[PDB]
């Protein structure tokens, strides 16, 4: 259906020696497709999906210059922000930034975003209108006043509504074999006695894509929230995801409980029973 492209940048200062560590990752939906790591040997933006490997040498040169430029801007900003927050030169600090766009089923622009954080707290974010800034505190307010005067939001709006969506459309086309394919969860239930009179039922969803899923238990056709445990969705390490939900039940009453699985890859929600 709808799709997204997102870049995640992290800069971490190294007060003991040298320049900050800079890491950049790009995603299309739940698929990582590019990376840059200032500690890696290449000093280049690298491919991480087969469908991007086809891009010309100019694509790789431009992407490399862009992330190396941001890494230097982040290094300057770490110094500026240390001053804003009246911090010492001895501690390690972090700047993170995420930006991207969402397109609908027809490829049209839906939403754009560009937000950043200092030491894991919101600093400055482009509002949904892509015209103005939300500053979380007085240090971010100093940045907002400088950026309001310098057409910064206009440049982000032009990129998010243009370049961002055009490249996302190309990636979705080139990587359609995987990016536009859903992997339905492979589901199964396991049984684990907790005593001679109680047992845990655990409903598994494996090897699915995209990561969004809903796993719920019902007892006699109504939602069961008591005695349940739902783990956070986790990566399998092969590009797919995993999740399980469990409930403790009295032995002999297992048939009252049904697990319900909702995923984009399933035309109709799935129902499992022990």
């Amino acid at each position: 259906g709808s799709h997204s492209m997102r870049y995640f940048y992290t800069s971490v200062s190294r007060p003991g020696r040298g320049e900050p560590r800079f890491i950049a990752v790009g995603y299309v939906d739940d698929t990582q497709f590019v990376r840059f790591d200032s500690d890696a040997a290449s000093q280049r933006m690298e491919p991480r999906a087969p469908w991007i490997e086809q891009e010309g040498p100019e694509y790789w040169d431009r992407n490399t210059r862009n992330v190396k430029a941001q890494s230097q801007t982040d290094r300057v900003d770490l110094g500026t922000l240390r001053g804003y927050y009246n911090q010492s030169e001895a501690g390690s600090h972090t700047i993170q930034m995420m930006y991207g766009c969402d397109v609908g089923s027809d490829g049209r622009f839906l939403r754009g975003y560009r937000q950043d954080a200092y030491d894991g707290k919101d600093y400055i974010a482009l509002k949904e209108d892509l015209r103005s800034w939300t500053a979380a505190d007085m240090a971010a307010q100093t940045t907002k006043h400088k950026w309001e005067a310098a057409h910064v939001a206009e440049q982000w709006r032009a990129y998010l509504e243009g370049t961002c969506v055009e490249w996302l459309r190309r990636y979705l086309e080139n990587g359609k074999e995987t990016l536009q394919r859903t992997d339905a969860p492979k589901t199964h239930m396991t049984h684990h006695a907790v005593s001679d009179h109680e047992a845990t039922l655990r409903c598994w969803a494996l090897s699915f894509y995209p990561a969004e899923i809903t796993l719920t238990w019902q007892r006699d056709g109504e939602d069961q929230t008591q005695d349940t445990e739902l783990v956070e969705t986790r990566p399998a390490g092969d590009g797919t995801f995993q999740k399980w939900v469990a409930v403790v039940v009295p032995s002999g009453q297992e048939q009252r409980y049904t697990c319900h699985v909702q995923h984009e890859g399933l035309p109709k929600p799935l129902t499992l029973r022990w």
Partner: peptide, 7 residues
């Protein structure tokens, strides 16, 4: 395709 002023 990745893409900005100093803070």
């Amino acid at each position: 395709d990745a893409t900005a002023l100093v803070r």
